[PDB]
């Protein structure tokens, strides 16, 4: 089973930049490599086959290169229509795709706005307690959110969700949901989410007391 | 031009069967081989099956060999995929795809993909969501901006639609993608930033709609 | 310059699955010239409903 | 709905002839081709003949070619099968069947089968059965349960009916399927398990009936 | 003449089970294969044609699959009405049926009750001697019955008969009939039937003496 | 079993026409395609024409294309071959042949051949034979055995029969196959070995018979 | 037009022998080759199709083999009914037959008996002169007969005819007819036929003088 | 032998439709695939479409796919080409062609071409020509040879015929092929060299005939 | 039963335009397709059979094309008499019609005139209350009419009716009838119909008070 | 999974022919090349032939070239090996084997072997065995243990089964593998060790069975 690997996984770039992404095969696939572009919520479209042949209808700013086990896709001058995810695919022995490279819109650094929401009394009446920590309008996407319950870090009881880049201002939003039973929730006092981000000089901590 | 339309997807319990179809138009369907390719968040893109133009040769991925059967009806211009003994990991978006035209001795892959159809393999039963308010207060206020929202928890299956004030409020709305929980039920949140000076006077209600269960819930969010 | 007797004897999965546009378009003279027993034995609803005349 | 009624079956000596008929109703008989298919315990299901809607083309299996003749009477809506030079291996249940409706270039088979008529080719003469008791005793007793029965041997032809106490006793009765002997006579057994505490007091009589010969025998089975 | 073969010949199953039966042709029959269901003492009924097209009126729990020379019929969830014999049929070149697969009701193991019956005096007066060995209410169907006349195994002079599965408890009953001339019967003393079954740790032997 | 009977062959002048027929029996003639195949001493076996079961497609050998027309009458179970503009090289034995039954995608040929009918294309006129004696002498004697015969020269058409002493002499008789001469007339020889002690006393007469001309000649062969 | 060629043209064999004949096509015919048997004065009968499939009713001592352009027919043990002519036929593109291989009954060498017959007075009166040379009961079939008229070799004025193998002793008979005009015939004296055969150490010559 | 006859060509405005037909004879038309191939001075020979013997598979050149439709009527032995949405560059001579007979695995092309039919796609309206004299003088005389002619300008469509003195003068006549101008009208010249000593005495008139417009012009050419 | 589907359902076109409508079958029907024209309040008329044969009397501006499962009808130059509904029909296996394509007269955009009518006192005395909203002289046909009773949207209690294209100016008129019981009608005060149309930048609302 | 079942093997006289078949299931047979490999006690494992997936290329070992012909029927999923002119050294167990899937430029061998079928080339005629007793005595006694047996000599073909007391005695039984003698007949021995104190009282009978000849022999072994 031929393994494919794409680098980088994510590339932050700006309009007009020169973009180069790489794709490597676990074994020699000669030149039988294709590149596909996919925009979110839409079907993939073929860009390049035989590692360097441009598909009909594809603008000339796309080019392919490479042979053997290393291949590259180059965009000479990035345009706003080119912000999408790019997959390579070997078709030398069956068909396997790479993990995909997403081209991200580069912008200036913006620190997140942090908000916390406690569980509602109705949900507590329903037998569950959800605590929500919200990070609004931040860039870049990498951030860390740690839950602390009476100064004790939580693990395996939270879930995170991240939005795509906003079309208007290219920011991210992230939600972290801590879910607990009513008994687990009422067996403790302090509930905090701590957030670290490269745009923040110091970690930001929001916290509440149960009942406060 | 070339057009491919998948149909037949839906919710199926593990172990049951399901038949997907792909209607092709805009080209001579009987002259081309076809692929079925699936995409899931956990495994990315993953090839499933290939069929020759006349159906004489078929190939399958190792993870599906013996369970899936690909076929075609050139008189109807239809590609079929019968999936038996479905497992949880088969939940994905399935695309049909057309092999490109090339030289006789070249290797071949796909150039045109279909629209895609979603297949969700889960033992969860259809269930409307519970809508709980994420109430703004002093702990969620920085200056003149506050954040409020609605938590849409424990529904199945996907998707659900959320609007605010019947669609009148769209500026600053962030509906997060749903996440699948350990219980097999989906859950998501929808948040909006509002001027703090409007708290206590402007009424904010989130309208959650879930067509599979015909659930419609208007939940009022009040400040603290 | 000879053939490698140990080369790949299988069928290349990534071969040409389309139809060959330059293949034989003529009718095969030595094809099946007999009738088909499992042909259509039922009358045709949309056959001739009038006289010869 | 569609209904098919076979007639003409019976006992025939080897070498003689027999004509089977099949009456069709519930559909336009003249618009469909028909099959004759037979079933025997030794060969299973076996196609016999096919005829076109207008009779222009007929086909026969190799084992029956030259001996059987299939025909039809569309004015009477009747299908016929004239069987000459019958052999012993032709004993089977014969069904008439209607071809399904399909496309002009498809291959065709049958969708509705008739009820079936039994044909028995044997040189045995009509003969009533001998009924012998299988008497229970200490050698056929294990605890409080004993077994008794009736052996219905050397009769021809099929079938025979067996009841117990004129039908009043049906719980625990096992009548085995008849077997054809080398002599062309049939034989079977009927057994029943009874409480040992009832022997000698409860009366058990097996009633063998053979309508073709008007044979009625009531044999009492007493223990030893 | 295209040969058809179905596997397995008999399948023991329970209500709600997933059932899969296979059918193979001696040569390629493309997709021209039909499946017919037959209940005992009843005419066959059409279930599937073109190997995967469901006949009108057939519940959706039936499905077909296969092409070329290998075909399968699948019942996703077995129901009590589905206990019958299923035949495949090629109609690519004339028409030939398989031997048929009978779906059997799976139940717990039940050991047979063994009874032996000697020939009646009336039949002996008639010139024949039938000895009957009876196995009542046993499962599964596989069993071996050996006739021994003065400890000598018989062959070619016996006939066996088996009932269908009882409607009430899904058990079998078996009769074995040993037929001999009056002279052969009176030229020996001991008459035994020996029975072996997978539910019996040791073989069971019943015997009687002529005249006893 | 399958039986095919050709008819219509005979002597025809070059440039004239001739119609051959083939009667089929023992099988459903209308369900099978047919061939006409000819055999000549100069070319061996040579395929001539093929016709489909319904007559929709016909094919011809290159040497006969445009001159021969193959047809069939399924109502009469008869195969026809109309031959126009005959040339000298068309003299041959013509067989009709039945295509075998096979699979749908196989190639096809013939399995049962007809009896064959002889066609002789020649401008020679009907002519009785000249019978000349092959006289035995001392130069045709080795030991007690001598050889004598009759030369049957310049006859048309075939065949001729030769007997010796009204059939009374058969031991040692060799009737040679006829040979076609440059003049279009046939010629052959018949020889017989006799005891040398019988020369001069036993009378030997060869009886040549030619039914087309009703010729009967009894020629006595005497030594010189 | 696919050319077919059979080898050998003639094969002398004996009862019980293993016989193998070959057939080659001018181009690849895949496996679409049939074998037909023909007995003298009788219609051909089909033996093998698909190059290796035995026709129903054909004894098992016949077998076919081969693919592409080379094919063989094998008779494991020859029987007297198998003495006939065998033709191969490609049916890949139209239909063409080979020249045929005749299986001959092999026997010991026997030298020919030579007889000569002069022209009759009646034929001389008719204006033609035929001289007949007869070779009786010889084997094998290959022999050469040369006509010499006053020691001058003739060419182009003779015709030969050969009988089939005698049913009783498997021998041949051959007639050679030299035809000349009455003027050419009466313009010479000596008329001889010279015969060579593998059973003769020296050629045998028979001759007569015109008028003698 | 093989014969193909095209018909249906002519002048058509851009955007309109046109149906070409090809009548085949001399061979079994239903047994062969066919091509349509066009030829223009600007593009040379250019393949257009191919159809299988039964019409099951059709292929088109990329420049015409979606606009042209190839079909056939095997009962009439006729090949058809329906051309919709015609553009100016489709003006060409169209030939139908027969695929040769070959081996089963070979690639195929055409061996016999039809006669050809001309198709002219132009928005020009039918219009007669203007005939102007090319008058000879001292400036068109070299020795005893002079040149004179007629200019046939601004006519549509092709063709036009030119004769000199009602056909009595043909030696030395050069009629140039027509050229298409920017205005969509054709123009050509016809010239003839004559002895200078004959000027003023021999009468020279060019006769232009244009059947599509029924134009007949006799223009006298006089010296200067 | 072969399913037929026509696209588009409605096509707005003008005199002199080139019109192409498509028709697709669920399975291959070879060339056995007919096209029928039907004018409103009039019987259908045959235009084309065998997919490309023009019926006698049909002008040459009509043409058919297509084979297998895709068929097209083309009008080279539209004429005012050709504004009608066109149906395709397969006759390969029984007879099934498409949904039909209606050719609409294309014209300039005209905004609707909106009028509202309250229930009459006589109908209220009869026990029913019908409220009528009228849209006059609008194009295109797509419009939305919403009934609002004290700002509450109604659903399932109204019916709409649309006229054909006016012969003089090619406009539409639409009536919406809201039906309520006298008790339901008298349990509210304000009754409004709101109208949205692509030629209107903002919705138009007409309203009255119950009893006014 | 992958399954291969050989059939057709047996006893054949030298000089005759034999055709082996190999039925494949569990995978796409037409996509893989196949091997025939044989194994004999004298030469070990020995490759015989290889065939491509489409039959285009075949190769043979030098010892079998010109005598064996490998072929395949992809429509039946069957591999064939026609063996002509068999010699004595061709006696072996023949396996069919499937080539593994690999890379395009690698060399290839087999990964899945069939069950194997035995081919015995011998001129020996079918013959039942001779059973001789191996009688125990003082000269075959060491302490309390004695040995007795049965010698099964001069039988053909393989195999033969030996049991003791109808299978009731299995502890200490050693049946040796058969050995081929100069006469072409096989021979073997079966021995058993018994307590010496049981000799003379316990009855020991060896039951030799030879299905090819339907031989059943019960030989009683008594001490001396």
UniProtKB/Swiss-Prot annotation, chain C:
Sequence ranges of the Sequence repeats: 2-5, 6-9, 10-13, 14-17, 18-21, 22-25, 26-29, 30-33, 34-37, 38-41, 42-45, 46-49, 50-53
Localization: Cell membrane; Cytoplasm
Chain coiled-coil ranges: none
Post-translational modification: During host cell invasion, proteolytically cleaved at the cell membrane in the region I by a papain-like cysteine protease of parasite origin. Cleavage is triggered by the sporozoite contact with highly sulfated heparan sulfate proteoglycans (HSPGs) present on the host hepatocyte cell surface. Cleavage exposes the TSP type-1 (TSR) domain and is required for productive invasion of host hepatocytes but not for adhesion to the host cell membrane. Cleavage is dispensable for sporozoite development in the oocyst, motility and for traversal of host and vector cells. O-glycosylated; maybe by POFUT2.
Biotechnological utility: CSP immunodominant B cell epitopes are primarily located in the central repeats. Antibodies against CSP and particularly against the central repeats can neutralize infection at the pre-liver stage and thus makes CSP an attractive candidate for the development of vaccines.
Similarity remark: Belongs to the plasmodium circumsporozoite protein family.
Function: Essential sporozoite protein. In the mosquito vector, required for sporozoite development in the oocyst, migration through the vector hemolymph and entry into the vector salivary glands. In the vertebrate host, required for sporozoite migration through the host dermis and infection of host hepatocytes. Binds to highly sulfated heparan sulfate proteoglycans (HSPGs) on the surface of host hepatocytes.
Domain writeup: The N-terminus is involved in the initial binding to heparan sulfate proteoglycans (HSPGs) on the surface of host hepatocytes. The N-terminus masks the TSP type-1 (TSR) domain which maintains the sporozoites in a migratory state, enabling them to complete their journey to the salivary gland in the mosquito vector and then to the host liver. The unmasking of the TSP type-1 (TSR) domain when the sporozoite interacts with the host hepatocyte also protects sporozoites from host antibodies.
Protein name: Circumsporozoite protein
Record organism: Plasmodium falciparum (isolate 3D7)
Residues of the full protein shown: 180 to 232 of 397
């Amino acid at each position: 089973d031929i393994q494919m690997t794409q680098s980088p996984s994510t590339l932050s770039t700006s309009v007009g930049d020169r973009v180069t992404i790489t794709c490597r095969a676990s074994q020699s696939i000669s030149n039988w490599l294709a590149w596909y572009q996919q925009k979110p919520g839409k079907a993939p479209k073929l860009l390049i086959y035989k590692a360097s042949t441009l598909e009909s209808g594809v603008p000339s700013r796309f080019s392919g290169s490479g042979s053997g086990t290393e291949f590259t896709l180059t965009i000479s001058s990035l345009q706003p229509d080119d912000f999408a995810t790019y997959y390579c695919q070997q078709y030398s022995s069956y068909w396997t795709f790479g993990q995909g490279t997403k081209l991200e819109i580069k912008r200036t650094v913006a620190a997140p706005s942090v908000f916390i929401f406690p569980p509602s009394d109705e949900q507590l009446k329903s037998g569950t307690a959800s605590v929500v920590c919200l990070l609004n309008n931040f860039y870049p996407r990498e951030a860390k959110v740690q839950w602390k319950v009476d100064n004790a870090l939580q693990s395996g009881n939270s879930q995170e969700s991240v939005t795509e880049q906003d079309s208007k201002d290219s920011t991210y939003s992230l939600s972290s949901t801590l879910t607990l039973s009513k008994a687990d929730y009422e067996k403790h006092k302090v509930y905090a989410c701590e957030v670290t981000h490269q745009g923040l000089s110091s970690p930001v901590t929001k916290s509440f007391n149960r009942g406060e | 031009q070339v057009q491919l339309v998948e149909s037949g997807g839906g919710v199926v319990q593990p172990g049951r069967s399901l038949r997907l179809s792909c209607a092709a138009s805009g080209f001579t369907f009987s002259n081309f081989g076809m692929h079925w390719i699936r995409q899931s968040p956990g495994k990315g893109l993953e090839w499933v099956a290939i069929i020759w133009y006349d159906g004489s040769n078929t190939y399958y991925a190792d993870s599906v060999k013996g369970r899936f059967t690909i076929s075609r009806d050139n008189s109807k211009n239809t590609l079929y995929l019968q999936m038996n003994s479905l497992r949880a990991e088969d939940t994905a978006v399935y695309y049909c795809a057309k092999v490109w035209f090339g030289e006789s001795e070249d290797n071949y892959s796909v150039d045109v993909w279909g629209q895609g159809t979603t297949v969700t393999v889960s033992s969860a039963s259809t269930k409307g969501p519970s809508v709980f308010p994420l109430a703004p207060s002093s702990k969620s206020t920085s200056g003149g901006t506050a954040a409020l929202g609605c938590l849409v928890k424990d529904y199945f299956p996907e998707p659900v639609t959320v609007s605010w004030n019947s669609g009148a409020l769209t500026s600053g709305v962030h509906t997060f993608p749903a996440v699948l929980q350990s219980s097999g039920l989906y859950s998501l949140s929808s948040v909006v930033t509002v001027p703090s000076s409007s708290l206590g006077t402007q009424t904010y209600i989130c309208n959650v709609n879930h067509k599979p269960s015909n659930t419609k819930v208007d939940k009022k969010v009040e400040p603290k | 310059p000879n053939a490698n007797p140990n080369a790949n004897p299988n069928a290349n999965p990534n071969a040409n699955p389309n139809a060959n546009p330059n293949a034989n378009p003529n009718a095969n003279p030595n094809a099946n010239p007999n009738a088909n027993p499992n042909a259509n034995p039922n009358a045709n609803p949309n056959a001739n409903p009038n006289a010869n005349p």
